[PDB]
Design a protein around this ligand. Structure first.
Ligand SMILES: CCc1nnc2ccc(N[C@H](CO)Cc3c[nH]c4ccccc34)nn12
Ligand code: NA
Length: 123
């Protein structure tokens, strides 16, 4: 396993915005409770899960546990930055697997719910 993505970085400029608060309170917390959220709630542990090539293939890992901690720690500058992390997480699943896999069906359902939730954001 490589080290997980950082959730603090003291030199990085941080912001709190209404959209970032919404991404935590509404978007993240809704997706977290979905019946398909559990594979995505923590960094992939390639040793535990017996995926020895996971990090041979996935070079920008991301997961909702990391995203949640980034939001809680005010790590982001803007909502787009956090949205990019969600997109990376979904894309990584599609890259490491293939169409029709159970894990891909999960990611697809979560991605559709995510898009539904970010279709309209606060101002
Ligand atoms: C983000 C996690 C992730 N990304 N690519 C993958 C590829 C395999 C994988 N194995 C899961 C580890 O818990 C267990 C599992 C085996 N078949 C499944 C079908 C649906 C849901 C889980 C599984 N996890 N994985
Ligand atoms: Na919304």
């Amino acid at each position: 396993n490589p080290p997980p993505p950082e959730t603090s970085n003291p030199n990085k400029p941080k912001r709190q915005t209404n959209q970032l608060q919404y991404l935590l309170r509404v978007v993240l917390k809704t997706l977290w409770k979905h019946q398909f959220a559990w594979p995505f709630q923590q960094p992939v542990d390639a040793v535990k899960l017996n995926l020895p090539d996971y990090y041979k293939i996935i070079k920008t890992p991301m997961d909702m546990g990391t995203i949640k901690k980034r939001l809680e720690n005010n790590y982001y500058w803007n909502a787009q930055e956090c949205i990019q992390d969600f997109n990376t997480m979904f894309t990584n699943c599609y890259i490491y697997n293939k169409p029709g896999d159970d894990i891909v069906l999960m990611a697809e359902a979560l991605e559709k719910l995510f898009l539904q939730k970010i279709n309209e954001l606060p101002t």
